[PDB]
Write a protein that binds this DNA or RNA. Sequence first.
RNA 1: GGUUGCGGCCAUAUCUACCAGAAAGCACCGUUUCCCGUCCGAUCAACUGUAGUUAAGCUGGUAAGAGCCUGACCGAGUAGUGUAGUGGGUGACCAUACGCGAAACUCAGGUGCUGCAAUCU
RNA 2: GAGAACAGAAAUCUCCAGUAGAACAAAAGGGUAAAAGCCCCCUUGAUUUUGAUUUUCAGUGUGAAUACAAACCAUGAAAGU
RNA 3: AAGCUCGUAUCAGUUUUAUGAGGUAAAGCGAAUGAUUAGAGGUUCCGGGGUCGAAAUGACCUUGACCUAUUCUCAAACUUUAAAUAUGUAAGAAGUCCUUGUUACUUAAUUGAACGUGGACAUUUGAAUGAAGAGCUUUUAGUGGGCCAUUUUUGGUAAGC
Lengths: 36, 169, 159, 294, 208
Amino acid sequence: PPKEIVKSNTSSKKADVPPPSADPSKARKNRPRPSG
Amino acid sequence: QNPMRDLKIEKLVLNISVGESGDRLTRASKVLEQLSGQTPVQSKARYTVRTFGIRRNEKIAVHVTVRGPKAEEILERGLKVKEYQLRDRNFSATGNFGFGIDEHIDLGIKYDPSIGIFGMDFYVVMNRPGARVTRRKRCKGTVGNSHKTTKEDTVSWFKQKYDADVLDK
Amino acid sequence: GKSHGYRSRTRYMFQRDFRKHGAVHLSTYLKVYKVGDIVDIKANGSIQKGMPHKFYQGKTGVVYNVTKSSVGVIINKMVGNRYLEKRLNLRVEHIKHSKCRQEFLERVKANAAKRAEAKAQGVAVQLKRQPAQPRESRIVSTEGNVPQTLAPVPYETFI
Amino acid sequence: AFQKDAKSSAYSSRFQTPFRRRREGKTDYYQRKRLVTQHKAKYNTPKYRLVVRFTNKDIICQIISSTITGDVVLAAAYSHELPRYGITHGLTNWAAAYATGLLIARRTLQKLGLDETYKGVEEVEGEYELTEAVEDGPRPFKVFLDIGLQRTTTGARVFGALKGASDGGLYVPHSENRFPGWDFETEEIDPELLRSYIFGGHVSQYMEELADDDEERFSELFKGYLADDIDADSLEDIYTSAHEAIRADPAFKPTEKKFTKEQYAAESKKYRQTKLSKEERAARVAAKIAALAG
Amino acid sequence: ARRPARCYRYQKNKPYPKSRYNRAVPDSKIRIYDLGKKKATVDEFPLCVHLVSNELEQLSSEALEAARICANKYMTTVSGRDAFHLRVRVHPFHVLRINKMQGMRGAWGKPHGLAARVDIGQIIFSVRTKDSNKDVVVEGLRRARYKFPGQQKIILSKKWGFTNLDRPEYLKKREAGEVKDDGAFVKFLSKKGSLENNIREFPEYFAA
RNA sequence: GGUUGCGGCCAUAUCUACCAGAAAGCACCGUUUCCCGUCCGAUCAACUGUAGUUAAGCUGGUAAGAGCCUGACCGAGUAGUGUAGUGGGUGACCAUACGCGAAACUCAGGUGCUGCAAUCU
RNA sequence: GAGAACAGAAAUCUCCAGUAGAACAAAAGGGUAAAAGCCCCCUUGAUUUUGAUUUUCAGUGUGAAUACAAACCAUGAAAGU
RNA sequence: AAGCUCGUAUCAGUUUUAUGAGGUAAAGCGAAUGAUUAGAGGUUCCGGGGUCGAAAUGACCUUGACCUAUUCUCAAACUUUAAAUAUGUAAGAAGUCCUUGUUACUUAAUUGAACGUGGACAUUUGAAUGAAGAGCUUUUAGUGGGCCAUUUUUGGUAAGC
Ligand SMILES: [Mg+2]
Ligand SMILES: [Mg+2]
Ligand SMILES: [Mg+2]
Ligand SMILES: [Mg+2]
Ligand SMILES: [Mg+2]
Ligand SMILES: [Mg+2]
Ligand SMILES: [Mg+2]
Ligand SMILES: [Mg+2]
Ligand SMILES: [Mg+2]
Ligand SMILES: [Mg+2]
Ligand SMILES: [Mg+2]
Ligand SMILES: [Mg+2]
Ligand SMILES: [Mg+2]
Ligand SMILES: [Mg+2]
Ligand SMILES: [Mg+2]
Ligand SMILES: [Mg+2]
Ligand SMILES: [Mg+2]
Ligand SMILES: [Mg+2]
Ligand SMILES: [Mg+2]
Ligand SMILES: [Mg+2]
Ligand SMILES: [Mg+2]
Ligand SMILES: [Mg+2]
Ligand SMILES: [Mg+2]
Ligand SMILES: [Mg+2]
Ligand SMILES: [Mg+2]
Ligand SMILES: [Mg+2]
Ligand SMILES: [Mg+2]
Ligand SMILES: [Mg+2]
Ligand SMILES: [Mg+2]
Ligand SMILES: [Mg+2]
Ligand SMILES: [Mg+2]
Ligand SMILES: [Mg+2]
Ligand SMILES: [Mg+2]
Ligand SMILES: [Mg+2]
Ligand SMILES: [Mg+2]
C-alpha cells in the first residue's frame, strides 16, 4: 500500500558472484557451536 | 578543552535481517515503522547465495535510521532490555556502538500474532558539533584529530549518563 | 590478420602525461585563435571528439577556419614525391599557439627599433643575424692559477 | 591517526593533486568550463557571469568575466549594503536577494549606459518576463546564471537574485519553474505567490501566526523586529520603497575605511608567525640531539 | 634430449620471459640461490670473492644448478658446511624456444628451458667467509668455472662481505655508531629522517 | 598584512603529528509556518542572526618527518649513440678517431605564487 | 580496518580509511572522480537537406570518423550539450 | 620526347638560429604493474598443528599467512626519468606600423571579425651554403620475379635459409 523505499548501492559490480572474502577456506574449524 | 565539543548521538539505525522477502519481510517492516513512526527503507541482496536461500536484489532486509530526541527514547528503550550492560567490543574505535536484541516486543510494543516476533540490530552513531564539515557539499573537509570521536571518549560517555556498565575486558 | 585502425600504435602517444590526467585547465579554452595563426598540433586523449589523427601529432600548421569549438588547420602532408594540402578540424584542446614565430616578431619589433634608433642617429646598422664566430685572441693569467699537471690513472678493480 | 591506514612513500609520490579550488571544494570546474568558454568565432568577446554566492547571512552578487591572468569583476553588490536602502533585517532571505539582484542589475546597467533605456520592470506584479530587446537600439546586456554549487530546487533563493536581476533590466536567460509558486503537477506559475516572496510575504505571514500562537519563539527570532517596532504587515512596504531607493541611487558607496592600508597590515603581522632560518633549525637539531642524547 | 649447450649460447633474441603471453614454460633447474650459512651476521664474513663473467652470453639454469652444486659441495666439505655464504647473483628469467620435430612452415617455438642473460663484468657467484678461508673459496669458484660456457674469472672483492662499502669504510661506519645489525644484512644510520625514531634505532650513536 | 567571493597556473600548494591564531570575514551553530528534498530537516530547502562557539573547518608555524620542487665539474663526459678504418679478437666481442650525451646515485636549497572586486585594528 | 540479535568464510546495518587499485556490452590499449562510473528524472538528434573535411588512398571507391551550414526537436535554472 | 611562361627568379636528400613533437636505446625496481632470492622485526577474538587444560573473546610453544623496514635478481607485448639518429613549423614586400571604410556575421555597444581606401617605414629584405637558373604542360616506352654489402632487426639449432 505505501511506496516501498529501497537503498541505493553505490558499488559498481554487475556480476552475481560472491566477493573474494567469501571463501570456504577461511572457516575456523571447531567453531563454538551449540549443544545440549 | 571542551566548550562546544560535548558529544551527541548522530543517529540510531535499527536493522532486521531476514532470509527472504514476501510476507515475513513486510511484517518486519511494519515492526520498524510503528517503532520509529517513520516509513522505513528495505535493502536488496547484493548477490545470490542459496545456502541462505537468497538471490541478488531479492529485498532481503529492512532498516530505518533515526535522529534527534526520538532516537534517545528508542535507544534507552532498548538499553533497558540489555539491562544497561554492553561489552568492550560493541564499541568501534571510531567511537560508535551497537547491540542486538531478539524479540522486538521486549521494549514497549504489544504482540499481534498476525505480525510475529523479530529481532533487531540497534546501532548508534556518535559525532560532535562540527559534524557537517565532512557532510555538507561546499568546502567538504575532515574533522581535525582532537575533535574526532574515539572509543575511549565514547565508553566513558556511555559509562556516565545511562549509568550503565561496559563490562568484559 | 594485420591491423590498422584509426588510432593504431597510439598507445603511448595519446597517453595522458604522468600526474597530469583529468579535466583540462581553463586557459586552454581561453586562448583566442584568429585565422592565420601558427598552431602546434598535439592530441589530448581525454578529448575524443575533434581529435587529430596520429599522423599530425607533433605537426605545426596554420588555421584557416574558426568555428564554435574548433580551428580548422591546413597542413602540408608529404605523400609520394609531392606535398598535398590537407585540412584538419581540431578542437582547441588539441591546439596551442606556436612559439616558433615568437622570436621572429620580437626581432621584427626589435629590427624596426634599431633601424629608427640608428637611422635617427646617422645609420651604420648591420641588423642581420650571424652564426657563432670563432673565438678572439685572449691572454690568460697564471697569477694565482699555476697550471696543475695531470696524468692518466692506473687500472683498478673495486668490485 | 590510525597506524595501519598509512600513506606509503609511493602513495605520496604518485598522488595527483586535484587543482586547488577543487581541493577546497569551492569550484566545480566542469561547470566553470561550460560557463566560461566563449564561442571561438566570437574571439575576445567576454562571457559575463552572474555570480550569486550565499555566505552565512551575507549575499554576494557579482558580474564577472574571465581572463587567463584572473577573473575580473565588472560590478559587485552585497546584501550588507542594503541598510543604505532601508533593510536592516533578514539580509539572508529571498527578498534580500531579489533586492541585491536588482541592486546589481541597475548598478552595472548604470555605469554601462543602458541605464536610462532598459529600466526593466518597475511595476513588480511578479509575472514571468525576460527584459526584451529595444527596437532600433543597443541590445540588453547579457549575463548568465552562475549557481556555484547551489542545488537546483524549485523555490531556492539563488533564483531570487535572478528575478531581481531579470526584473532589474539585465538579460539573464531563465525559465519559470525554479521559482516559488511553481506548480509541480501542471506547468503553471502563480505570480501572486512569487510576488509575495519578493517583498517577504512568507516571512511576515510567519510573524503573523507567531504573535498569536507562540510568542516565545517570536521573542527569540524576530527580536530586532520588536526592538525596531516593525511588525508584520509593514514588511512589504520596507522592500517596496527600497526598490525605489535602489533604482534612485545604485552608485555604490564604499565605507570610510578607518585605518588605511599600512595600518591594517602593521597590526596583522603581530599575529602572523615568521618561519625560521636553516642555521636556527640546524641549531634546533644540534640541540635536540644534545638533549635527547642523554 | 637436452639440446647441446651451443644452440642457446649467445643472446640472439630479445628477452622471452615467462609471462601471460607465455605461461607454458617448465620449471627452472636451479632453484635455491643461497647456501652455506645464510643467517650469518654481516660482521662474521668480511672477505668477499666473486665469479665474474667476462662474456656477454647466456647461462642455462641446468648449468647454474651444476656449478652451484659444485662450488658449494667443495667449499662445504673443505672449509665446512657453515664456513661460507654462497649466493648466486644471476637468475634464469629467459625462456628458450625450440622447434619440435609440417616444414619450416609455422616454426615458432615452444618453451624448451630457461637461462639467464649474463653481461661482461657481471658477477655470477658471490661468496663471503673469513679471510682465513680465501683459498678454499677461490678454488671452489675455480671448480665451478668448468661448468660454464665462456670466459669467467674469479675476483677478490674490495668490499666488506656482501656490503656496498669498502673494508676501511665499513669499520669507520661500524666503529662509530652508524651500523646496526639486521638478519643477514645491516641497516645504516642516515642523517635524514625524523629525529624522533632515528634515535629510537641506533641508540648506540649520539655519544661521540 | 588578515579575510571573503571569482579565480590563473595546478603538490614549493599534497600528506602525517603537534601547537599558535587579535580584528573582521568565514565557519559551526538556532528553528520548521512557508517553497522545496529525504527511511531520517544529517544532506538538500526555507526562516532567524536571534540563543551559544573558536571545538572543528580555515589561516599560519614546528619537523636531522613522508612526498613534491630546484640546483651542482655529485655520479658521469659513465651508459647509450651519429660517423670511420683492408683497426684487435676464432668468436663472443673490444679498444681507437670525430661528434652527441642519459637515467639512477650523492650533495645543497626550497615548502605555493599571484589576479579582479568587497572587506578588516 | 573497527564495529551490531539469530548470522557462520559469505546475508543485512554503521563508521573510518580509500588516485581509482573499480566500473564503462565485448578483444586489447587509451580515456574518465562533484565523471565518462552508480541511482533517478525528462526525452528520441539513432531525425530532415545537401556540401566540405580526416583515415585507408589512385589522394577512386567502401566502411568508419571530424568540424560547420540550414531546418525541426530533446534536456536542463542557465551557460550548454 | 615536345616544348611553354619567364628570368633575379623562385630554388635545395645541407648547415646555423628560434620553437614544437616522439617513448626506442640506456636507465629503474629499498617508484606503480608483473616477476624474483634471502634473511630480520612486528600482528590474530580469527589457517592449521601441539602442551597445560571443564572451558575461555585462555596462557605458552609452533607452522603458515599477512604487515613494516630491508636484501639478490628480471620484462617485445612494464615504468617515473630519458638520450643519440632521424622529424613538424618559423628566419619578412604575400613584411611591419599609423589612419579609418564596407556587412545581411558578431558584440551591451560602430563592439569585433573578415577585405578594404589612404599614410609612414628601404635597403645589408631579414642566418649559412650552394644554384645555372626557375616555374608549367602534355603525351608515351620499358617495368611492375630482384639480389648483395655494413648497421638495425623477426622466425629458426643453424643455412650460401
Ligand atoms: Mg548498484
Ligand atoms: Mg562501498
Ligand atoms: Mg597486428
Ligand atoms: Mg608523452
Ligand atoms: Mg562519437
Ligand atoms: Mg554540476
Ligand atoms: Mg649430438
Ligand atoms: Mg632469432
Ligand atoms: Mg670455462
Ligand atoms: Mg571572530
Ligand atoms: Mg539542523
Ligand atoms: Mg541549507
Ligand atoms: Mg585550538
Ligand atoms: Mg595546517
Ligand atoms: Mg624533506
Ligand atoms: Mg679471421
Ligand atoms: Mg666518444
Ligand atoms: Mg633535502
Ligand atoms: Mg609545506
Ligand atoms: Mg587506465
Ligand atoms: Mg553530472
Ligand atoms: Mg542528436
Ligand atoms: Mg571516405
Ligand atoms: Mg573497418
Ligand atoms: Mg618502454
Ligand atoms: Mg613501442
Ligand atoms: Mg632494454
Ligand atoms: Mg630509471
Ligand atoms: Mg617492482
Ligand atoms: Mg623529474
Ligand atoms: Mg622578405
Ligand atoms: Mg596599402
Ligand atoms: Mg628470384
Ligand atoms: Mg647466394
Ligand atoms: Mg638467397
